[PDB]
Amino acid sequence: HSEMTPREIVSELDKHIIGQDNAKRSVAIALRNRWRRMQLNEELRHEVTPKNILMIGPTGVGKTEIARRLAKLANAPFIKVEATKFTEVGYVGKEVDSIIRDLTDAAVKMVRVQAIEKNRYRAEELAEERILDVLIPPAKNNWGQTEQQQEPSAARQAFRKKLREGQLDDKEIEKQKARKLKIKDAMKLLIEEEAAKLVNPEELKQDAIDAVEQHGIVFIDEIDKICKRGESSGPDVSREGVQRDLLPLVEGCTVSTKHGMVKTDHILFIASGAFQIAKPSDLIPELQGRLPIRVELQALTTSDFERILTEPNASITVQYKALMATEGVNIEFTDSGIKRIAEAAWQVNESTENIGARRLHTVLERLMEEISYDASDLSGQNITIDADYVSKHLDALVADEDLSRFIL
Amino acid sequence: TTIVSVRRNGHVVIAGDGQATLGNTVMKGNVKKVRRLYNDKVIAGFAGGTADAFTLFELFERKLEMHQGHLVKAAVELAKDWRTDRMLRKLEALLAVADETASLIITGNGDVVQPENDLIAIGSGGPYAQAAARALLENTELSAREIAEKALDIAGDICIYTNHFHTIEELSYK
């Protein structure tokens, strides 16, 4: 769909993800390839398949984020499944086809909500005419000067102008309606009333299929958790099973959905792993083949942490400022304040368990717990979160490890 | 009754008397037999029920709305239903209708008639009016209004069913 060059894709991705440039280019080549395909002939369009990617890296460093923004950047249906979610099907459990179903039920919850945007003006334009007709019951067979029904547009224009907020005046209009009612109702009762007429069925739902088949993006988290490990055997065939079960989906097949027959042949798959226990070559042959692209993501550094705090669009720090504004409070982060927030986050991750950038949300959130509460009773103030503030609120917590496993 | 219409020098008119008769006596002497239609653009006169009118003229107005002021068409479309619609079929009358374009007669039969010179003379006194109008129109420089008027008087003078109450409706255009 999008005509963005890889380089432009990576750029656009740099607005939400710090670092991890390689994974960015990998995911960017993939998207651009979908464009590259449509520019080919009949034969070669069937033959050319998605270049599925296998992202390799430690927790919370941007794997899913990259895949989510990539998806969002191409207004593509996106689904994220955890691979072990099927390791129990040997006893019972969701079938893998569910992936394509969900990638469909959300590929719908998408075309639906996005059919409310396109149809949010129609009910308030060529449909607000409902009340205006009961405000000034049109002439007995309008004449015909294509400006005659635009003429009032004096008596008329006055009713539409006064309808800029003034209502609650009960009337009635038209299974059409007829029923007598208000306007904080007849008007809204009109919103949906005239909107279901513009949107049809066998195209809306027929399109979700079109999307999924053409722009679907499946993200299989922890694919490494279904590889074989030298600890047992019974659980391995269980794992290797999910691999075989996943095989049809990435090799090309047909799945049944209560919306129609979906074809996976062109769904893009981004698998994800840590590969500390297993290695990508432990994946079954058929799967390694369908996972041509391999890209690693590095662990995050304190500097990456500082940058993640403020650089992205709608960064946690930015959001925070916004939210405190809601309370009429002006929050401000000095460079050293942020340098310390990141510092703390790094400390806890190093002293206890490493959870990557996630740690910033809990640290940031604890740090602010006080302002968040008092925010309403501080209205009209300029609060500055500087290094001092940061230290007074986090030091004790970070310093105390056992407490860190609970509170941070 | 006598309805007279005349057109001369960018001036068209329709004039009528006001006598309604029942047997050998006068029921009323001031019946308005000439009105105005289509946002005072189209004039008209008639012979018949006061309701048949208020039904045949209202509709005619709509046919004009369904045919952009084009007199003739609405007219053609009018006489259409008037001879078809089960109900409409019962109304009896003679509409004289005229606009800057042209003037003509519609009859329950569905006919649309354009008289020799946009000269209309319908009703029991019709011919006496026609005779006097024709005379004047061919031997004097008088005006469309002066014609219909004088023609109408001549009529009411000959016609036992026509009086001297008038209702004139002009229209200037040039």
Ligand SMILES: Nc1ncnc2c1ncn2[C@@H]1O[C@H](COP(=O)(O)OP(=O)(O)O)[C@@H](O)[C@H]1O
């Ligand atoms: N490189 C990065 N740039 C921006 N945000 C990041 C980055 N890495 C992690 N995060 C943040 O941490 C959370 C971790 O999830 P995610 O990024 O999906 O990675 P993973 O799939 O490895 O757990 C996300 O909500 C994201 O906002």
